[PDB]
RNA sequence: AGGACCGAACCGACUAAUGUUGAAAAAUUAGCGGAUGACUUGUGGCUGGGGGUGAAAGGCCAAUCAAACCGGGAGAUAGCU
RNA sequence: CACAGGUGGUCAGGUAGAGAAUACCAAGGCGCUUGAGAGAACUCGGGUGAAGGAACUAGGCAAAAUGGUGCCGUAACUUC
RNA sequence: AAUUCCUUGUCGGGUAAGUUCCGACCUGCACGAAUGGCGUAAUGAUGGCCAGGCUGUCUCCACCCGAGACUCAGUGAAAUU
RNA sequence: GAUGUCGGCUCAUCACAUCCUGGGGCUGAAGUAGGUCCCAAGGGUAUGGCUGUUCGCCAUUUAAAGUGGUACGCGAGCUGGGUUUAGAACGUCGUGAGACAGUUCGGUCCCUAUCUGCCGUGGGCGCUGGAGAACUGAGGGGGGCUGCUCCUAGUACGAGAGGACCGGAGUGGACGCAUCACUGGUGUUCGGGUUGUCAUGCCAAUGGCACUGCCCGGUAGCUAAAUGCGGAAGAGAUAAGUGCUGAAAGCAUCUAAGCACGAAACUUGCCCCGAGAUGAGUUCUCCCUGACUCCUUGAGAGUCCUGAAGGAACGUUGAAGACGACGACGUUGAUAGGCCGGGUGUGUAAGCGCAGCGAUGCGUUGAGCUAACCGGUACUAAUGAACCGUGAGGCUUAACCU
């Protein structure tokens, strides 16, 4: 349940390969307002599929 | 679904009375022993009923030279030839399983006169 | 294997999702719109409209009944004389969700719960 | 001979006039459109390609619509190929009915199996589990020893471990075909087939024999 | 399901009135006896003047069984408690000269025509 | 009346499971024993290292006991590593 | 250690209950300083179980089971 | 036999089957009379055996409820090498 | 400067000096049943009582209850009964401290897996333009057990008692695969009964808490004890064995040429995986055929315009699932929730009226409620977009059309 020889960076690195994040793909752009949202989000101010939402 | 339904209902009875469990009812049941077929009579008290269609079944438990038998009829079995309901019971449950441990002066359904 | 199973456990006994419901319910009531997490928004879908359902056919049982659930009389009191005749005419679909982002504090997906007439 | 492709609508009882319940499943074997016929000169081997149901225009993509448009046949949810004997011949296009289990006793049915997750190895392989009392500890249900030991020093290929379970092609060999009703697109097979309810199931003639 | 170490009762007039399966015959492995299937039972309660005594160990089959047996219908038959009649170890014949209790259909065979034609009901 | 009985506080620690880089350098959960007595407990005091104290186990004497801990002889000696 | 441990005395309500047990609650205090989702194996703490009922095992370990008040009744043995 | 080796002594009981248990025999390797002998009611978280009840202890596991395990966000060790 | 040491459980795997089934020779083999030897490792190969015991004895089975190797397999898998800590006692030894492969009672079994290995499961790139799908199949794995009854047939054989080979059905045991129609289990998300208590002002009705408070049933799902299916038939090459023809050796001889038969072993036949099978296969189908510089003129680099088939991402999700993955659907919409109708389950709701002094009973009422089920319904949520993917795909030779 321990290491017997120190792993290397090399395989340190390796293993973290698959650690990596994913960038969002692209942002939705609200049709009335323009805002940018994430898909099937409400905008930042309300907004969602050209419509007001949320007061404030 | 709709294919299966129509499947059970091409062979479901029609005849089958309406009972509740509590009732004293008589089962006559095709016996084909030998070459020859005949018919047997199971009487006892309903326990049991098991409503789903086709697969519609009931409970009928009996005490037989002081050995209580349980017998489970599929309601739609060409083997059940006929049922008749030779008392009426009144009890407040769906499943008489309680009967098990009666027998006797404890094991009595009321009769349920409407 | 959960297969055909239905209702989230939501990491809750089953008496405190029944009291949580309860109360989501009944804030989501009062204020016609809350944000909760998605998963809790979308399992008070469950709850919230059938006691709009219940609340459209009037009745001192179906009060009793909304009652029962739910358990405070301001909230029939909305429910039957607001909520039942403003939805009388809409088959269903009396709540809308929303998606809002993420929480704060732990990442939790959030979503907004409407009443669809809000 | 060849199989054609049903849908597993569920299972259901038939009472025979003597008072005996036949469980049996009900295959919805709607007809299967031929959509390409492969030959030795062109692919090394016999068979044929069918397609069944039908599937959304705008989810049918282009390379799937333009084969079968080849065809000319309306585009089905799927495609099979089944092998060929050598007496046997069919052409592009012809609709294959459930008729053709008509004078057929017994079929094998082939489909996917209920994916049961991952199954430990009390399930998937039926090991004995461990005394529930008796002083155990933490090993109720382990898979208990794995191997020998400096000899071989290493688990064995194949071994029995837990992992995933189901959810793979099964064979369900020569069952009694009870009714074949073409008017309905109707199978009913004595038995229980792989799959759960909605499944694709392929049905061959019996190959045991 | 008869297993080992199970008590049937008796269900003829033999003298025995307990008795507990002591082995599964018919085959390597077997785990449970259903109606009409011999098993291999000891004695364990008697009565005083009865045929066989306390501790005797001789055959017997198994005519009721809380489990039931399943027609071809699909109805099972639950009675309510185990009982076997008894049989010599050798001539696999009754002891007893009465069965008590209901029988069942399981035993319309050749070898226990015995115990079909001396029961009360047949099931 | 009782080194009586059943049983909470209080005192213990018989079984089991957990834990065994623990929540804890000996505990937790479920049961368990005494529970007006040879009981238990607060406060203060006394007995000290070949010595104390011990309903006795070589037990306890500051998480240390077939002879405490700290400083010194002392950089003991080590045909051993 | 912001540690499931240890620490002497005083006050001590309502209902049921013999009770300072126990269940629900007042007065009062608190939700235990990471949360959210999913609902695999396996582990921990629990619930239920067909027929059987110690066949398990070193051993009925564990679990199950019994459980109160009033009355009836109560053996061998005994230092009575 | 808390003693007994040979030994699972032999006979009887209990069990379908009993190296354990109970009652005996005596051939006490290697009991024995205050480093006490033989009995003994009551007592025991004491040792052995047996029976009734009861059960997932087991035939043989199945399902379900929770806490982890699994994924996401924050913090973030360890033995070992 | 530590390789845990008996037995038990779970899990196995190999050998053949084979226990059973399979094929044979000889027999002091009439038959059944044997004895013994040869070939054969595909599969199978007990449950209990005693004891800590493997072992052994015994009871009862079975076709059989094989012998061995694997650190007398298997404690980073479990146990801790045995033996080897500290307590205590017995017999014996010793003056004594103490000792005894003599016993008797008691006695803390740690580890979060880095690497190899194995069971699953994905990401990347490759496969020579890109994409979707179907597939061939090298190769690998799974499976292979057997009884009992009946017919043949009281036939052959036999003084009789007894009792067949060969061949054919029926039915089980163990094991495995699948499934939930049935019998059931669970079903803390459904209905009801009831105890204590607190609360909703009170009655009535309900809710919380008490292990789901304790129970009684039970929908879907998952399940087994439940129900279907499987072991094959056949083919090829053989083993031990049996031969035909046949000389060497005028005969003889199964062999030296030549021909034949021959087993659950082997190769197939059955089922599953399987083109990373870098030897990267095949067949369909679909998509993209615009300009322009620089030169390090190379299978070169770059700009503009253009983004195709498709994919991915996101959302609703699934009898798919740890996460990935896979499947369905995204308004040209039944993917999920809701709603509607039904089924199912529990079992005559509340309110009101009547009878009763009252608990309570009766009528509306088989009512009310009803999760995961079924058939429908766009009411809510699955938004236009955006993102990746390009712009006809190297060289040589051959054959074709020219
Ligand atoms: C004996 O040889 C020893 C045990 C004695 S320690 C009680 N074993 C070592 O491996
Ligand atoms: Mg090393
Ligand atoms: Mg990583
Ligand atoms: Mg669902
Ligand atoms: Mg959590
Ligand atoms: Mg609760
Ligand atoms: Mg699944
Ligand atoms: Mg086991
Ligand atoms: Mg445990
Ligand atoms: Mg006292
Ligand atoms: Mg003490
Ligand atoms: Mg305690
Ligand atoms: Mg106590
Ligand atoms: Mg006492
Ligand atoms: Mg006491
Ligand atoms: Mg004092
Ligand atoms: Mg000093
Ligand atoms: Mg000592
Ligand atoms: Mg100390
Ligand atoms: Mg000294
Ligand atoms: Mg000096
Ligand atoms: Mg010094
Ligand atoms: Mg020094
Ligand atoms: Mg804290
Ligand atoms: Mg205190
Ligand atoms: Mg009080
Ligand atoms: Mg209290
Ligand atoms: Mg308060
Ligand atoms: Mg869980
Ligand atoms: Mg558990
Ligand atoms: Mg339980
Ligand atoms: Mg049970
Ligand atoms: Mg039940
Ligand atoms: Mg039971
Ligand atoms: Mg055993
Ligand atoms: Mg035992
Ligand atoms: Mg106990
Ligand atoms: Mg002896
Ligand atoms: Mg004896
Ligand atoms: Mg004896
Ligand atoms: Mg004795
Ligand atoms: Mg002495
Ligand atoms: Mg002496
Ligand atoms: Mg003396
Ligand atoms: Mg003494
Ligand atoms: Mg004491
Ligand atoms: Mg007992
Ligand atoms: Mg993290
Ligand atoms: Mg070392
Ligand atoms: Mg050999
Ligand atoms: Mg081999
Ligand atoms: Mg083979
Ligand atoms: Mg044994
Ligand atoms: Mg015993
Ligand atoms: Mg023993
Ligand atoms: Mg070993
Ligand atoms: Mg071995
Ligand atoms: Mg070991
Ligand atoms: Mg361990
Ligand atoms: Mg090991
Ligand atoms: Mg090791
Ligand atoms: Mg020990
Ligand atoms: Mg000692
Ligand atoms: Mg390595
Ligand atoms: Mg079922
Ligand atoms: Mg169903
Ligand atoms: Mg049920
Ligand atoms: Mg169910
Ligand atoms: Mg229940
Ligand atoms: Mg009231
Ligand atoms: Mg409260
Ligand atoms: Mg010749
Ligand atoms: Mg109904
Ligand atoms: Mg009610």
């Not at chain 2, 006929?82 to 441990?101: F, T």
């Not at chain 4, 049996?24 to 030795?40: F, G, H, P």
């Not at chain 4, 194949?158 to 009694?176: F, I």
């Amino acid at each position: 349940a321990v290491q017997q020889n120190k792993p290397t960076r090399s395989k340190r690195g390796m293993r973290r390969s698959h650690d990596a994040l994913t960038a969002v793909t692209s942002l939705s752009v609200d049709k009335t307002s323009g805002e940018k949202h994430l898909r099937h989000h409400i905008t930042a101010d309300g907004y969602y599929r050209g419509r007001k939402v949320i007061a404030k | 679904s709709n294919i299966i339904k129509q499947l059970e209902q091409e062979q479901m009875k029609q005849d089958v009375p309406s009972f509740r469990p509590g009732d004293t009812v008589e089962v006559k049941v095709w016996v084909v022993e030998g070459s020859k077929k005949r018919l047997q009579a199971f009487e006892g008290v309903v326990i049991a009923i098991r409503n789903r269609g086709l697969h519609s079944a009931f409970t009928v438990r009996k005490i037989s030279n002081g050995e209580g038998v349980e017998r489970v009829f599929q309601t739609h079995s060409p083997v059940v030839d006929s049922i008749s309901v030779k008392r009426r019971g009144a009890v407040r449950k769906a499943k008489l399983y309680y009967l098990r441990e009666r027998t006797g002066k404890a094991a009595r359904i009321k009769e349920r006169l409407n | 294997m959960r297969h055909r199973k239905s209702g989230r456990q939501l990491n809750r006994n089953s008496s405190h999702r029944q009291a949580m419901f309860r109360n989501m319910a009944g804030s989501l009531v009062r204020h016609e719109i809350i944000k909760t997490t998605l998963p809790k928004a979308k399992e008070l879908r469950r709850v919230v409209e059938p006691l709009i359902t219940l609340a459209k056919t009037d009745s001192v049982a179906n009060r009793r009944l909304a009652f029962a659930r739910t358990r405070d009389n301001e909230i029939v009191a909305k429910l039957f004389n607001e909520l039942g005749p403003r939805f009388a005419s809409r088959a269903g679909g009396y709540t809308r969700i929303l998606k809002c982002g993420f929480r704060a504090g732990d990442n939790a997906p959030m979503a907004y719960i409407e009443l669809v007439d809000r | 001979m060849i199989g054609l492709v049903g849908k597993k609508v569920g299972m259901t009882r038939i009472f025979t006039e003597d008072g005996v319940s036949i469980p049996v499943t009900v295959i919805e074997v709607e007809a299967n459109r031929v959509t390409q016929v492969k030959d030795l000169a062109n692919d090394g081997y016999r068979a044929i390609q069918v397609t069944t149901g039908a599937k959304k225009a705008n989810r049918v993509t282009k390379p799937e619509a333009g084969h079968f448009a080849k065809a000319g046949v309306e585009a089905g949810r799927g495609l099979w190929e089944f092998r060929l004997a050598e007496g046997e011949e069919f052409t592009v296009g012809q609709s294959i009915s459930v008729e053709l289990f008509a004078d057929v006793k017994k079929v094998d049915v082939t489909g996917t199996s209920k994916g049961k997750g991952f199954a430990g190895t009390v399930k998937r392989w039926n090991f004995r589990t461990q005394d529930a009392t008796h002083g155990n500890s933490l090993s109720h249900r382990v898979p208990g020893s794995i191997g020998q030991n400096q000899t071989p020093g290493k688990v064995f290929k194949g071994k029995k471990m837990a992992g995933q379970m189901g959810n793979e092609r099964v064979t369900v060999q020569s069952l009694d075909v009870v009714r074949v009703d073409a008017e309905r697109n109707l199978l009913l097979v004595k038995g229980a087939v792989p799959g759960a309810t909605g499944s694709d199931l392929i049905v061959k003639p019996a190959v045991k024999a | 399901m008869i297993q080992e170490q199970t008590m049937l009762n008796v269900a003829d007039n033999s003298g025995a009135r307990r008795v507990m399966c002591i082995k599964v015959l018919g085959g390597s492995h077997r785990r449970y006896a259903g109606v009409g299937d011999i098993i291999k039972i000891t004695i364990k309660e008697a009565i005083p003047r009865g045929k066989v005594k306390k501790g005797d160990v001789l055959k017997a089959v198994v005519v009721r069984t809380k489990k039931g047996v399943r027609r071809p219908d699909g109805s099972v038959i639950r009675f309510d408690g185990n009982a076997c009649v008894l049989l010599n170890n050798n001539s696999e014949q009754p002891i007893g000269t009465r069965i008590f209790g209901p029988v069942t259909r399981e035993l319309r065979s050749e070898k226990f025509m015995k115990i079909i034609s001396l029961a009360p009901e047949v099931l």
